[PDB]
């Protein structure tokens, strides 16, 4: 039961300091290096640095040297990653990992990351917590009968993720896809939910999307109606 | 000092013996140990090969690794590709004993026939326009495998500014969807005869068209 357990998700603004943790259990914390790895959203892994908790011997990637501090508290079996002034560019997932293997100055020795923490999500943005507005994505009232129409909701300008969308209070589920959110340059999110329905029923059927954004306790229902 | 280069994507059906290359740009690839990591979608990474060719205990036997000094590259080989092998793979080595990572490779296990995407394109609503905003909303669904390229046209001129696009996500039927947004001011929106959302998937385009008139 070797465990590297990282601290919870963090939402922060530029200028704030932050210290995340990575706690090792089930083994001798001071006998194995702990590495730190960054993954920006949609990108690849980057090495940040590494620390031996026994003596706090610490090595940094040149890209991160002086940008972040890596420390360890052997008494608590914990390693840390630290910033004094976050940038929105520091939005990433952070992984710690233990360099395991056999520590002998030997042909028999070897070293590799054999256990990873689950990751800590750091989101840095100037946005405060904010409820969305909801705009209609409407089908034409002229669309050929015996056909289908696509209709939806555009959920704009909310923070932080996530939001839940449903249709007709649950009574409409077939062909409903709710898409991932997009980040906008002001640090707010938007997403769409869309449903495909048979054209012939547009003039009788009522379509309502139900939007829920828990962080701001926002629940709104939006009617989507055919245009002309 | 050096970059490690991997193919952006490799895709084969199960059963296949499949390889991911990792090419060192400067200095012999044979000078420093090479590691490979597997990272499944939304999961932490794990180490599948270390020290060029060593396989960790829990890693399945189908994983092996080698060095090709004549191509100055290292190789991860999967002998008998399986669906759970679908992941990003990263090679890594050492510079000044600073760890250099490869750009990563997306490995798709072709588990079902090719499906062309459905496209749906919404013009700005009169209500959004009233809010002094305009967003073109392009929805892409039911495609396999899960990679598309999105291009936006104003009349027949391309547009790259104000485009945000989501990376594909799996649906309930194990196919993929994605979305793409084009943000305009109301002035720009009415200043073109039409707008188009063009989705290329496995070399072929599916498009919808929208006009202010």
């Amino acid at each position: 039961e070797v465990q590297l357990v990282q601290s919870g998700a963090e939402v922060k603004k530029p200028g704030e300091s932050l210290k995340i943790s990575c706690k090792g259990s089930g083994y001798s914390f001071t006998s194995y290096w702990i590495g730190w790895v960054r993954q920006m959203p949609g990108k690849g892994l980057e090495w940040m640095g590494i620390i031996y908790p026994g003596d706090s011997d610490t090595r940094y990637s040149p890209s991160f040297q002086g940008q972040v501090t890596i420390s360890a508290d052997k008494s608590i079996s914990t390693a840390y990653l630290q910033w004094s002034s976050l940038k929105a560019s520091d939005t990433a997932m952070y992984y710690c990992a233990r360099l395991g293997g056999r520590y002998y100055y030997d042909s028999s020795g070897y070293y590799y990351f054999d256990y990873w923490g689950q990751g800590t999500l750091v989101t840095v943005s100037s946005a405060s917590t904010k409820g969305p507005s909801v705009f209609p994505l409407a089908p034409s009232s002229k669309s050929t009968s015996g056909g289908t129409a696509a209709l939806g909701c555009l959920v704009k300008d909310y923070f932080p993720e996530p939001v839940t969308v449903s249709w007709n209070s649950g009574a409409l589920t077939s062909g409903v896809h709710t898409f991932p959110a997009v980040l906008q340059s002001s640090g707010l999110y938007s997403l769409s939910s869309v449903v495909t329905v048979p054209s012939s029923s547009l003039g009788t059927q009522t379509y309502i999307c139900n939007v829920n954004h828990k962080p701001s306790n926002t629940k709104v229902d939006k009617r989507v109606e055919p245009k002309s | 000092n050096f970059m490690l280069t991997q193919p952006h994507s490799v895709s084969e059906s199960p059963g296949k013996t499949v390889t991911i290359s990792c090419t060192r740009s400067s200095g012999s690839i044979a000078s420093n140990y090479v590691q490979w990591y597997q990272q499944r979608p939304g999961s932490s990474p794990t180490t599948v090969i270390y020290e060029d060719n060593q396989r960790p205990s829990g890693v399945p036997d189908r994983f092996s690794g080698s060095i090709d000094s004549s191509s100055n590259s290292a190789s991860l080989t999967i002998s008998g590709l399986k669906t759970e092998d679908e992941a990003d793979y990263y090679c890594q080595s050492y510079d000044s004993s600073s760890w250099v990572f490869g750009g990563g490779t997306k490995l798709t296990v072709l588990g079902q026939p090719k499906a062309a995407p459905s496209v749906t394109l919404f013009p700005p609503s009169s209500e959004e326009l009233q809010a002094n905003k305009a967003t073109l909303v392009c929805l892409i669904s039911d495609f396999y495998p899960g990679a598309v390229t999105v291009a936006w046209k104003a009349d027949s001129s391309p547009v790259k500014a104000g485009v945000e696009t989501t990376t594909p996500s799996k649906q309930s039927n194990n196919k993929y969807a994605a979305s793409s947004y084009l943000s305009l001011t109301p002035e720009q929106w009415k200043s073109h005869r039409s707008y188009s959302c063009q989705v290329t998937h496995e070399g072929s385009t599916v498009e919808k068209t929208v006009a202010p008139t």
């Binding site: 520590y103 | 000078s31 420093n32």
Partner: peptide, 14 residues
């Protein structure tokens, strides 16, 4: 040999 020597120099602690 040399590649193993290098990781020892990087990672070894008693």
């Amino acid at each position: 040999r040399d590649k193993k020597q290098k990781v020892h120099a990087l990672f070894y602690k008693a």
